[PDB]
Design a protein around this ligand. Sequence first.
Ligand SMILES: C[C@H](O)CNC(=O)Nc1ccccc1
Ligand SMILES: C[C@H](O)CNC(=O)Nc1ccccc1
Length: 435
Amino acid sequence: MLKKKQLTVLDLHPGAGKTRRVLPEIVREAIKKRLRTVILAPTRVVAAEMEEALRGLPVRYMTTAVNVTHSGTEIVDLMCHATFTSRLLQPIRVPNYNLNIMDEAHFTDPSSIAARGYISTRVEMGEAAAIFMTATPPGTRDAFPDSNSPIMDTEVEVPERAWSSGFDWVTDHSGKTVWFVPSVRNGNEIAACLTKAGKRVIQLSRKTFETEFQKTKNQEWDFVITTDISEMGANFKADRVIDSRRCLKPVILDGERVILAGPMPVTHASAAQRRGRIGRNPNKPGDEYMYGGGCAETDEGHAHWLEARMLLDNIYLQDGLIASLYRPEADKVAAIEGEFKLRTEQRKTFVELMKRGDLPVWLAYQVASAGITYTDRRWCFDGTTNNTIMEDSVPAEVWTKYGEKRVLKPRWMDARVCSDHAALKSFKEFAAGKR
Ligand SMILES: C[C@H](O)CNC(=O)Nc1ccccc1
Ligand SMILES: C[C@H](O)CNC(=O)Nc1ccccc1
């Protein structure tokens, strides 16, 4: 496994112990063999759980999710997927990792896809070894994999709106339920209905995940309402998953705008991970998985794979060579390797628009490749009339950095900057020059 030129997919079923049992064995072996190693966690929550599994072992934690005093002698680095790719985009000396370990390696956010592409390319070049840990590798077709204890699988109509009758089984349940919704806004409406019905609800999404996930440990709850972020190794003490089996898909239309298409079916991988939240306790058989639709391979044509190519085109590898996407996910996007390579100053703008600007990759690329500098926000206001962003059914307005009240009307429209109240608030702050 640890030998150079080898990429290993550790595809044990969900809950089989990849993170708590196998990972520490690999790390002890890597240290014995003096292999410089990186461990990539999908989330800060997983990074902290890895610290518990790896406690005692000399690991440098490159995350403020862990409070450790390092020795400076560690040859094993641990960071989130996004941090790895983020540092690769910056003028930062990159250690030669002989061994590259990615946990929850099914994660489809652009920076995770890019990290797999960089790593697998280095393995293909004979420069390194890699281990990708996931029950659901790219292209998996089995939504119902093995579990630690038997699961009751039931195809059932699942509400996606508030309801007054017809779904008694949802609220008649006395255990804890994890409910996967297609979007934050959808989750808000279901959560309000459950709260009105007397349930205690916690809501999880990408921007709130680390903070809100702690509440699943610190307080009593009946329902966790979550987007697909909880597919990435989030552990709950639950006995039921309700799965809409739906997600939103960012889709680039006519190379000029990004829409959030759907809700549409999840992939088999996603469905298996959603289901995989339960059936984890061999002493508690009969956890329930209620699913409200079929699976489809909706990662095909999904903007994240094009965005991953934008990131990798702007990461140095060797001379003019450019890292390929990991082979099993390399034909998901029509994309020409190298087509998004930016010159020095535009590439720095691109990085800053993602890092400080917090803009989606695709949108950051449009701005940077247009030769616009980071602090120049005129593009947020000079788009066509159908790019007007709406707030409470009237055009959203901000005061520009010049002190002028203007309608938010970006030259490039990416629906992710206004998909919920929090997103729009952050984009308004950006348009105003506030970061
Ligand atoms: C997101 C991360 O917190 C940012 N970077 C780090 O923490 N970097 C780091 C920490 C310890 C040793 C060497 C490097
Ligand atoms: C003190 C340690 O060597 C810090 N480790 C790293 O800086 N790791 C790193 C740097 C660039 C890209 C990806 C990963």
